[PDB]
Amino acid sequence: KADPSHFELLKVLGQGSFGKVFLVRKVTRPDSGHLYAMKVLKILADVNHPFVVKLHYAFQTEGKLYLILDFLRGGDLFTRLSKEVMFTEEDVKFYLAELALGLDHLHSLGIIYRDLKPENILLDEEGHIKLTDFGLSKEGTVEYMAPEVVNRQGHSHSADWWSYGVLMFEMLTGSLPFQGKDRKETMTLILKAKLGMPQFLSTEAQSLLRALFKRNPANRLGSGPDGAEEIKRHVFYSTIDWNKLYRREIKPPFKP
Numbered sequence: 001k002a003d004p005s006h007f008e009l010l011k012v013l014g015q016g017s018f019g020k021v022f023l024v025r026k027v028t029r030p031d032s033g034h035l036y037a038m039k040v041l042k043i044l045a046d047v048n049h050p051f052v053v054k055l056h057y058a059f060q061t062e063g064k065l066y067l068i069l070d071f072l073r074g075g076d077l078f079t080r081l082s083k084e085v086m087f088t089e090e091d092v093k094f095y096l097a098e099l100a101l102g103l104d105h106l107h108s109l110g111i112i113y114r115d116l117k118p119e120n121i122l123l124d125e126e127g128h129i130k131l132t133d134f135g136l137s138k139e140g141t142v143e144y145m146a147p148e149v150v151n152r153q154g155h156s157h158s159a160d161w162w163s164y165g166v167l168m169f170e171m172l173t174g175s176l177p178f179q180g181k182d183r184k185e186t187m188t189l190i191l192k193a194k195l196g197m198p199q200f201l202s203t204e205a206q207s208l209l210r211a212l213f214k215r216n217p218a219n220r221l222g223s224g225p226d227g228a229e230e231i232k233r234h235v236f237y238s239t240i241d242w243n244k245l246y247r248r249e250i251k252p253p254f255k256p
């Protein structure tokens with residue numbers, strides 16, 4: 001059975017906001033040689049979906065909870081965003097569509113992806129995305145918080161779609177829609193939900209952002225009754241075949 005001795009440490013990927021994540025190589029059969037990302041801890045984690053990180057092994061060792069997950073070669077969207085400082089609508093439509101599927105699934109499991117942001121969206125070698133650091137059902141980066149969360153008036157699935165809107169805006173413009181000089185001001189800007197629409201954005205993109213940026217979570221796109229479909233049927237994704245996207249048949253615009 002699983003055991004820390006079955007994995008040799010290759011290198012530390014980075015300090016964590018969830019513990020430390022190491023790049024490990026399994027030493028035991030049958031996946032001997034296979035690379036994995038190892039997370040050590042001192043609430044669901046098992047989800048099966050093309051756009052959600054897979055948990056391969058989980059074992060407790062005296063206070064330490066080891067999680068062996070997929071190693072995503074491509075790194076995260078935050079890193080790519082910083083280097084390219086903004087993606088074309090083409091790239092954005094693609095990442096958001098796959099994210100749309102991943103997110104909705106997590107919502108069906110009754111999970112709320114509270115920490116949705118580019119840092120938590122990984123890319124595999126093919127360029128497809130994979131959501132990480134999810135799981136919590138019973139609840140951060142302020143720039144991504146929905147107004148009901150800032151005011152602590154609740155935190156349902158709707159909150160995620162607002163954050164989804166923020167991710168879209170940041171990838172499309174290189175900037176955050178609501179940014180103050182400090183956390184306080186940012187939260188106040190989120191509450192006013194006062195938003196200027198950059199003129200280089202397509203009308204379809206602008207339409208979608210306006211629908212996602214509804215202060216009242218009940219009027220926010222994704223708030224049913226067709227839930228995620230409400231967002232998937234938006235004109236912004238007209239050219240997206242969800243069937244093949246799910247099957248990973250759509251060619252990623254970016255290849256790491």
Ligand SMILES: CC(C)[C@H](CO)Nc1nc(Nc2cccc(Cl)c2)c2ncn(C(C)C)c2n1
Pocket residue numbers: 013014015021037038039053069070071072073074075076119120122132133
């Ligand atoms: C430690 C952080 C700097 C990074 C990026 O957010 N985290 C990260 N990078 C990953 N991949 C990755 C690939 C190439 C270079 C670098 Cl620095 C990271 C990764 N693969 C699988 N997971 C989790 C499910 C644990 C991962 N998590």
